[PDB]
Amino acid sequence: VVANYENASMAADYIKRVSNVLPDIGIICGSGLGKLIEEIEERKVIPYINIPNFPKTTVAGHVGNLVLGSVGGRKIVAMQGRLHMYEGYSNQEIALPIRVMKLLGVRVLLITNLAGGINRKLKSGDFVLIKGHINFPGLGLNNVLVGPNQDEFGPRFPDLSNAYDRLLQQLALKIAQENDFQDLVHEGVYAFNGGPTYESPDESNMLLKLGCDVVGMSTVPEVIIACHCGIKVLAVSLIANNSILDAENDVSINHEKVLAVAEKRADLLQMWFKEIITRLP
Amino acid sequence: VVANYENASMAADYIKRVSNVLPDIGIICGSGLGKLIEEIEERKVIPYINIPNFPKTTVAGHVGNLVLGSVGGRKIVAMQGRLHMYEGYSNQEIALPIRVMKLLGVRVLLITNLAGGINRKLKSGDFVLIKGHINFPGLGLNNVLVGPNQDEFGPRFPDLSNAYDRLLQQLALKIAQENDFQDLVHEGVYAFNGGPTYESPDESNMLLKLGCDVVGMSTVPEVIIACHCGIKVLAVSLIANNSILDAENDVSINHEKVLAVAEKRADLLQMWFKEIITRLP
Amino acid sequence: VVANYENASMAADYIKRVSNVLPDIGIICGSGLGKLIEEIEERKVIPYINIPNFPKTTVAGHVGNLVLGSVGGRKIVAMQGRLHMYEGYSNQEIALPIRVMKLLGVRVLLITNLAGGINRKLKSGDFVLIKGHINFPGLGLNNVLVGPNQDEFGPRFPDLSNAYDRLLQQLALKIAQENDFQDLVHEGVYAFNGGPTYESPDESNMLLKLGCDVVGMSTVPEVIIACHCGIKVLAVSLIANNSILDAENDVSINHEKVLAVAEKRADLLQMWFKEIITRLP
Numbered sequence: 010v011v012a013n014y015e016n017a018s019m020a021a022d023y024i025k026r027v028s029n030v031l032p033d034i035g036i037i038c039g040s041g042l043g044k045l046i047e048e049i050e051e052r053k054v055i056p057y058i059n060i061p062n063f064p065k066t067t068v069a070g071h072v073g074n075l076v077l078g079s080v081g082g083r084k085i086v087a088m089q090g091r092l093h094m095y096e097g098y099s100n101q102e103i104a105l106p107i108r109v110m111k112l113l114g115v116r117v118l119l120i121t122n123l124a125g126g127i128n129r130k131l132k133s134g135d136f137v138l139i140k141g142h143i144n145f146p147g148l149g150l151n152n153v154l155v156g157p158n159q160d161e162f163g164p165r166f167p168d169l170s171n172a173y174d175r176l177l178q179q180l181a182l183k184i185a186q187e188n189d190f191q192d193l194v195h196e197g198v199y200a201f202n203g204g205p206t207y208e209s210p211d212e213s214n215m216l217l218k219l220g221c222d223v224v225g226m227s228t229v230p231e232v233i234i235a236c237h238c239g240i241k242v243l244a245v246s247l248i249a250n251n252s253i254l255d256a257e258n259d260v261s262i263n264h265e266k267v268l269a270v271a272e273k274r275a276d277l278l279q280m281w282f283k284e285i286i287t288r289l290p
Numbered sequence: 291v292v293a294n295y296e297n298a299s300m301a302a303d304y305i306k307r308v309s310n311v312l313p314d315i316g317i318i319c320g321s322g323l324g325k326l327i328e329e330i331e332e333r334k335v336i337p338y339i340n341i342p343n344f345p346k347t348t349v350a351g352h353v354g355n356l357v358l359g360s361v362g363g364r365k366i367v368a369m370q371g372r373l374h375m376y377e378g379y380s381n382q383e384i385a386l387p388i389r390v391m392k393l394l395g396v397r398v399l400l401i402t403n404l405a406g407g408i409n410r411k412l413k414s415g416d417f418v419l420i421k422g423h424i425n426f427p428g429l430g431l432n433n434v435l436v437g438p439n440q441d442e443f444g445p446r447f448p449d450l451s452n453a454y455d456r457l458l459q460q461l462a463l464k465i466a467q468e469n470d471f472q473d474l475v476h477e478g479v480y481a482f483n484g485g486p487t488y489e490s491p492d493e494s495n496m497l498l499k500l501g502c503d504v505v506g507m508s509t510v511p512e513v514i515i516a517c518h519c520g521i522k523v524l525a526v527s528l529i530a531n532n533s534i535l536d537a538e539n540d541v542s543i544n545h546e547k548v549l550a551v552a553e554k555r556a557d558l559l560q561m562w563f564k565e566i567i568t569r570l571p
Numbered sequence: 572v573v574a575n576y577e578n579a580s581m582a583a584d585y586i587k588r589v590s591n592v593l594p595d596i597g598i599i600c601g602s603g604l605g606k607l608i609e610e611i612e613e614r615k616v617i618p619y620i621n622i623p624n625f626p627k628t629t630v631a632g633h634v635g636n637l638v639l640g641s642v643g644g645r646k647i648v649a650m651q652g653r654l655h656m657y658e659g660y661s662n663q664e665i666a667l668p669i670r671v672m673k674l675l676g677v678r679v680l681l682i683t684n685l686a687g688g689i690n691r692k693l694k695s696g697d698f699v700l701i702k703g704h705i706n707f708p709g710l711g712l713n714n715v716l717v718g719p720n721q722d723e724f725g726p727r728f729p730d731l732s733n734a735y736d737r738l739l740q741q742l743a744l745k746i747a748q749e750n751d752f753q754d755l756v757h758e759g760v761y762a763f764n765g766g767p768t769y770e771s772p773d774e775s776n777m778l779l780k781l782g783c784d785v786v787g788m789s790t791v792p793e794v795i796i797a798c799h800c801g802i803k804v805l806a807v808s809l810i811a812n813n814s815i816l817d818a819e820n821d822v823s824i825n826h827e828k829v830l831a832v833a834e835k836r837a838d839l840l841q842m843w844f845k846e847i848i849t850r851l852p
Contacts, residue, residue: 068719097718141492148493149430149711150484156378157349158486166545169490170536198492203712205720206795209731211703211760212710215781219496233487255732264728422773429774430711431765437659438630439767447826450771451817479773500777514768 012104014161016062020105021112023061028053030077032086034286035107035115035240037231039122039247041271045080045279046087052078057090064092064102075106081287086110093227094146095204100153100230107234108162117177117241117289119282120232123267124225124246125208127216128197131248133270136185136278137223138178138196139244142169144229146203153230154237163237172236176290177243184284190277197222199246201229210256217253224252243285247274293385295442297343301386302393304342309334311358313367315567316388316396316521318512320403320528322552326361326560327368333359338371345373345383356387362568367391374508375427376485381434381511388515389443398458398522398570400563401513404548405506405527406489408497409478412529414551417466417559418504419459419477420525423450425510427484434511435518444518453517457571458524465565471558478503480527482510491537498534505533524566528555574666576723578624582667583674585623590615592639594648596848597669597677597802599793601684601809603833607642607841608649614640619652626654626664637668643849648672655789656708657766662715662792669796670724679739679803679851681844682794685829686787686808687770689778690759693810695832698747698840699785700740700758701806704731706791708765715792716799725799734798738852739805746846752839759784761808763791772818779815786814805847809836 010016025031030053038046057063057073066073073090088106092098110118124137131137146152158165178196185191200216202208204226208216216224223246235242249267254260291297306312311334319327338344338354347354354371369387373379391399405418412418427433439446459477466472481497483489485507489497497505504527516523530548535541572578587593592615600608619625619635628635635652650668654660672680686699693699708714720727740758747753762778764770766788770778778786785808797804811829816822 094712095714095717142490143492143496144487144490145426145430145707145710146712147485147487148426148483149707149713150375150427150432151430151712152376152484152487154486155376155484164545165486167487168542168544169487170540170542172490202710203714203717204709205716205727206706206709206714206729206731209704209706209734211705211782215705218781219499220492259732261730261732263730264726423771424773424777425768425771426707426711428766428768429707429764431656431708431713432711433657433765433768435767436657436765445826446767448768449823449825450768451821451823453771500780501773 010062010101012101012108013159017105017108017112019061020063020109024055024075024113027055028077030084031114032077032084033114033116034083034085034289035110035118036085036087037091037120041268042121042247042275042278043089044275045282046076046089049076049078049080049085049087052076062105064098064105069096081283083286083289085286086113086115094230095226100156103153103230104234107231108238111162111238111240115240118235119285120228120242120244121278122225122227122246123249123271124223126248126251127213127224127253128222129253131195131223131251133248133250134193134274135248136194137246137248138181138194139199139246140173140178140196142199142201142229143219143221144201146201153233167237169233169236172232172242173244174241177241180288181243181245181285184281184288199228200224202226207262208252213252213256223248247271247278291343291382293382293389294440298386298389298393300342301344301390305336305356305394308336309358311365312395313358313365314395314397315364315366315570316391316399317366317368318372318401322549323402323528323556323559324370325556326563327357327370330357330359330361330366330368333357343386345379345386350377362564364567364570366567367394367396375511376507381437384434384511385515388512389519392443392519392521396521399516400566401509401523401525402559403506403508403527404530404552405504407529407532408494408505408534409503410534412476412504412532414529414531415474415555416529417475418527418529419462419475420480420527421454421459421477423480423482423510424500424502425482427482434514448518450514450517453513453523454525455522458522461569462524462526462566465562465569480509481505483507488543489533494533494537504529528552528559572624572663574663574670575721579667579670579674581623582625582671586617586637586675589617590639592646593676594639594646595676595678596645596647596851597672597680598647598649599653599682603830604683604809604837604840605651606837607844608638608651611638611640611642611647611649614638624667626660626667631658643845645848645851647848648675648677656792657788662718665715665792666796669793670800673724673800673802677802680797681847682790682804682806683840684787684789684808685811685833686785688810688813689775689786689815690784691815693757693785693813695810695812696755696836697810698756699808699810700743700756701761701808702735702740702758704761704763704791705781705783706763708763715795729799731795731798734794734804735806736803739803742850743805743807743847746843746850761790762786764788769824770814775814775818785810809833809840
């Protein structure tokens, strides 16, 4: 199934009939960082498997719902269970839910992820406002836009220089200052490691040489599809560990340690993003 | 359809019957840089769609012809509408037209493209003689030769150290000097960005650190197929912008600005390449 | 055919019936470096084509056998004819023979390859104990683990920081010292070039900047599948040439020169690895 205008329209038609909500904000939440979705008001939960043309997700299993409703007086749509390219999903499967968001009316997309720190100023539990990226799959002929262009959504050759909206970064920081946790908030350049293996110690050292501040396995595909079709983006990484320190000390990382950092910061990130949604222009 | 000896031979048989031209020079021209093809003498235009085993190009659309005839007394074959890997074409689809050129008798392939400048000496409207490359798809398991080797055309493990013929670079420069536009002509290393998104500002900064002089989304696949089967190559980039300056000043690039630079230099590039063809040993 | 638990089990059942050998050591030998396999005692040769669910290898041709028997009193299984990803094999085809080794009882995997030198201390004929890697396909969404996770074998997100066992490196060096050829033995970081073209001169220069000591087209996929399922690894590169010196002097590399270096060191590498196998804890 191609992520074209006709197919995205069929999915949006189904959703509109079921939910009655017309959202102008979309959210995609990182693993362990999804509690805000359970607090959406007057909500409607729609399993992916019920939506025409949505990608099949049963091989990987686990949760996969679209959730619509209200947060802070604003109308939103959330992806509960996000699709990652290291699972083997195609470019078309990743893109279609974002293009459905566009047809539903979404103008702003807020994204969180879990990442490794490369910059020596970054500690476990810090947040990074993403200001730019280094897309190793894209340089290497695995960009999410490889294929025919879908002209109704955007141009053949997108410019990504303003993919991460500057005013949304400023608003996120302002709210951190109001609540006295600005000491946790940095900005930086995100390296996309296709995954699913964590960056090796020598890959971490390479990324330091190349000007990367953080590294992770998600987010850049969604950012590119959003930018292509004119949706503004705020993306925030939660730092689980510093990969450069771990390489110097011969210390391992694993998914259990990552999820424990997510639990440690989940409630603060929930409160922060509720207020960002409330305050969006 | 595999780019093997039998399939390429069937396409060459059809072409020979229709054109009567036996070329020893091939040309592939960048977007907006194709006017020379309309000036081929006593020419024959053959739509791709009519040639046995040529790749299907109707999803992307636009022009796609092989053109045979004479330029400056020399017999040539041109691709009018080139195939780019960011459109989703496979390794086999890219390779077959070049291997058909080989079977038709081509010994020299001349290529132009549009590119971004990384080296700080490069300005919009400059030309770069390509002397080597950094192939990010090739390092990342998307080399155009991934697959079975077609032994009739070349070896399993090609050496690319002399892929860009030194004497052809010298001839191109000599002609620029004769016409007093040598101040526009540089040499440099080409980085292949698979595309179709322009390099991000932070990817540009990375490419500067890594010794790249220019960046673009084409050319390296064709160069590798040509070198594999013993065809000499001259490749010239037209610089549309300097990506490093644009990153420092927060200035965007887009396809409209690129095509306007092509129009500005099209007639000079036409004259230059007509004389290169005339003067080839 | 997916490299899952059921399919690997069917292949292991066939092998056990035919060979009666229960190995705890596996070996994969580089091109020209396979003579040890012909000296396995009381051996059993099993063509891949006869084993249920083994990948089809007839397009590439050449030898492809599993060989079981005894070396130095130890029970081993060898791959005679290894699968390389530049031939077009999928992730699933590469992984299944290693997962069969696991089900047969393999706890240690010994690997050799032919490689290019990047570090200026490396000469033709030197050996490099691999201590870490830079996986360009993995960064670029062509990691051997892209796809569904096979949970019975290992975790969704592996840590590769101890993929190259430190005590096995120490044992290999100790044996070199006992036989007075330690002057040939280095340690270093391996860059995976997907291939099949040799690294270009400008790619070599880039790899020097990025902290790579050697470059080659194999090994990292097998290491990752082994680490995922808890198999310890020793990997040794034979240096055929120094790519950085060749770039400064404009000297070519080719497969004939590579195989001649293999022949020059084959008997010493055979003796070394026979003793490593004998001495494994």
